[PDB]
Structure formats: C-alpha cells, structure tokens
C-alpha cells in the first residue's frame, strides 16, 4: 500500500562501559521501505566487522554491538538511515572507562 520516510522513535543514552566488556546500542527505526543504514565516529566512517556487529530487525529495531570494547573506541557515534522517500540521522556518546 502507501509508504514513507524514516522518523525518530527512541535512541539510547550516553553509555559508560568498563574496558574489555561486551556492550550494545539499540535504535528504534520506522520507515517504508526498510532504510539502508551507515555509521560514523567523531566525524569519520565506521564499517561493520566480527567484533563490531550491525543488524536490523524487520520489526523496526537496529542494533550496534561491541564484542570487546577498548579505550580507543570512546567518542560521539552517529548513524544515518535512508530510503526512497527521505532520510533521518541519530547520535550517541560512549565513555569507555579504562582500568590502568
């Protein structure tokens, strides 16, 4: 039937995580058709990998995971969601608590 752009629903708060733990971020996302999504940190891009996993449910929930976080991963993360009808953009901070 009808379709439309991605929009805001819910974003995570500024996290603070002990060095070497598992952690995750979870962004609710609602647009039709299902948007393409890209990621950033401090003004440059972030690709996915085996420790930096990226998945999105058809139920409208995008997840961004850290298998083993390190002090160099700290900063302002962002992402952008795009479909044929429009664009939306989201931001969060990560304060990685070192153990030196």
Curated annotation (Swiss-Prot):
Give the stretches traversing the membrane: none
**Residue ranges annotated for the Ig-like C2-type domain, each copy included:** 6-91
Its domain of life reads Eukaryota
Q: In which tissues is it expressed?
A: Expressed in skeletal muscle (at protein level). Expressed in skeletal muscle, heart, bone marrow and thyroid gland.
Where does it reside?
Cell membrane, Sarcolemma; Cytoplasm, Cytoskeleton; Cytoplasm, Myofibril, Sarcomere, Z line
State the oligomer form and interacting partners.
Homodimer. Interacts with ACTA1, ACTN1, FLNA, FLNB, FLNC and MYOZ2. Interacts with the C-terminal region of MYOZ1.
Q: Which family does it belong to?
A: Belongs to the myotilin/palladin family.
Q: Which disease is it linked to?
A: Myopathy, myofibrillar, 3: A form of myofibrillar myopathy, a group of chronic neuromuscular disorders characterized at ultrastructural level by disintegration of the sarcomeric Z disk and myofibrils, and replacement of the normal myofibrillar markings by small dense granules, or larger hyaline masses, or amorphous material. MFM3 is characterized by progressive skeletal muscle weakness greater distally than proximally, tight heel cords, hyporeflexia, cardiomyopathy and peripheral neuropathy in some patients.
Functional summary from the UniProt entry: Component of a complex of multiple actin cross-linking proteins. Involved in the control of myofibril assembly and stability at the Z lines in muscle cells.
Q: What is this protein called?
A: Myotilin
The gene is MYOT
Span of the entire protein shown here:
249 to 344 of 498
């Amino acid at each position: 039937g009808a379709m439309g752009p991605p929009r805001f629903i819910q974003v995570p708060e500024n996290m603070s995580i002990d060095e070497g733990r598992f952690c995750r971020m979870d962004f609710k996302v609602s647009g039709l058709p299902a948007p393409d999504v890209s990621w950033y940190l401090n003004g440059r891009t972030v690709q996915s990998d085996d420790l930096h996993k990226m998945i999105v449910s058809e139920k409208g929930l995008h997840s961004l995971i850290f298998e083993v976080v390190r002090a160099s991963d700290a900063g302002a993360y962002a992402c952008v969601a795009k479909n044929r009808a429009g664009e939306a953009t989201f931001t969060v901070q990560l304060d990685v608590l070192a153990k030196e």
